[PDB]
């Protein structure tokens, strides 16, 4: 593995004097036996928190941002290829449209708790 | 052989006689670990004092190296006091 200053990381133990498991942080220092990680906590304080390399993993939360940015650039190029609004913006989930379910192959069986 | 009469106070027993300090209980190395279901001996086995190096985070150069340096400093100070008592 490899690490560098300023990389995002999420604490993850492989009870251990503390319960910092799962807290996200960014690297601030590196050493052969450990890798430093800042951990903001509540006013917010600059509580640096070193951790063993075994109990760490690179965060993936920021990968979605770069992926959406590249997809937005590709959609903008595609919109330039034609005449249309790029419409690349994310949207909240929306209510399902009405649809006519058919009872032909699906008769509504009653259950009426047996209770069984 | 001549009797082993070369006893020495080692500069500590005199201070103990000068004060209220008393000999250690000598009851046992074992002592209960904090926030744990099993006793962790402080000497003669896996030690809680060395557990600090094994913890996944110190919340603060590596601090574990500083702790090992402090332990080596205490050991060298004990060896120096032993050699100084050897000198007399």
Swiss-Prot record, chain A:
Share any extra remarks: There are 2 genes for eL21 in yeast.
Please report the organism this UniProt entry assigns to the protein.
Answer: Saccharomyces cerevisiae (strain ATCC 204508 / S288c)
- Summary of subunit composition and partner proteins: Component of the large ribosomal subunit (LSU). Mature yeast ribosomes consist of a small (40S) and a large (60S) subunit. The 40S small subunit contains 1 molecule of ribosomal RNA (18S rRNA) and 33 different proteins (encoded by 57 genes). The large 60S subunit contains 3 rRNA molecules (25S, 5.8S and 5S rRNA) and 46 different proteins (encoded by 81 genes).
Q: Which residues of the full protein are shown?
A: 32 to 156 of 160
Give a GO biological-process term: cytoplasmic translation
Tell me which family the UniProt entry assigns to this protein.
Belongs to the eukaryotic ribosomal protein eL21 family.
Report the superkingdom from the record. Answer: Eukaryota
User: What positions belong to coiled-coil segments?
Assistant: none
Cross-link for Glycyl lysine isopeptide (Lys-Gly) (interchain with G-Cter in ubiquitin), residue positions: 1
Protein function:
Component of the ribosome, a large ribonucleoprotein complex responsible for the synthesis of proteins in the cell. The small ribosomal subunit (SSU) binds messenger RNAs (mRNAs) and translates the encoded message by selecting cognate aminoacyl-transfer RNA (tRNA) molecules. The large subunit (LSU) contains the ribosomal catalytic site termed the peptidyl transferase center (PTC), which catalyzes the formation of peptide bonds, thereby polymerizing the amino acids delivered by tRNAs into a polypeptide chain.
The GO terms describing molecular function are: structural constituent of ribosome
Q: What is the protein's name according to its record?
A: Large ribosomal subunit protein eL21A
The UniProt keyword set, sorted, is: Cytoplasm, Isopeptide bond, Ribonucleoprotein, Ribosomal protein, Ubl conjugation
Subcellular location field: Cytoplasm
Naming one, the record's GO cellular component terms include: cytosol
From Swiss-Prot, chain B:
Mark the transmembrane ranges: none
Region Disordered: which residues? Answer: 71-88
Cell location: Nucleus
The disruption phenotype is: Depletion causes defects in processing of pre- rRNA and assembly of ribosomal subunits.
* Top-rank lineage group of the source organism: Eukaryota
- Assembly and binders: Component of a hexameric 5S RNP precursor complex, composed of 5S RNA, RRS1, RPF2, RPL5, RPL11A/RPL11B and SYO1; this complex acts as a precursor for ribosome assembly.
Give the similarity note.
Belongs to the RRS1 family.
Q: What is this protein's function per UniProt?
A: Required for ribosome biogenesis.
Protein name per UniProt: Regulator of ribosome biosynthesis
């Amino acid at each position: 593995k490899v690490y560098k200053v300023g990389d995002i990381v999420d604490i993850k133990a492989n009870m251990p004097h503390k319960f910092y498991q799962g807290k996200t942080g960014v690297v601030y220092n590196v050493t052969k036996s450990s890798v430093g990680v800042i951990i903001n906590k509540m006013r917010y304080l600059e509580k640096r928190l070193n951790l063993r390399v075994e109990h760490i993993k690179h965060s993936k939360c920021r990968q979605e941002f770069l992926e959406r940015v590249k997809a937005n650039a590709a959609k903008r190029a595609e919109a330039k290829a034609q005449g249309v609004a790029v419409q690349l913006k994310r949207q909240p989930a929306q209510p399902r449209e009405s649809r006519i379910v058919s009872t032909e192959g699906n008769v509504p069986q009653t259950l009426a708790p047996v209770p069984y | 052989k001549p009797l082993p009469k070369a006893k020495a106070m080692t500069k500590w027993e005199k201070f103990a006689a000068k004060k209220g300090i008393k000999p250690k209980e000598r009851a046992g190395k074992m002592i209960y670990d904090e926030a744990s279901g099993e006793w962790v001996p402080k000497w003669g086995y896996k030690g809680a004092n060395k557990k600090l190096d094994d913890q996944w985070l110190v919340e603060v150069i590596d601090p574990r190296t500083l702790n090992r340096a402090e332990r080596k400093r205490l050991v060298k100070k004990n060896e120096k006091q032993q050699r100084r008592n050897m000198k007399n």
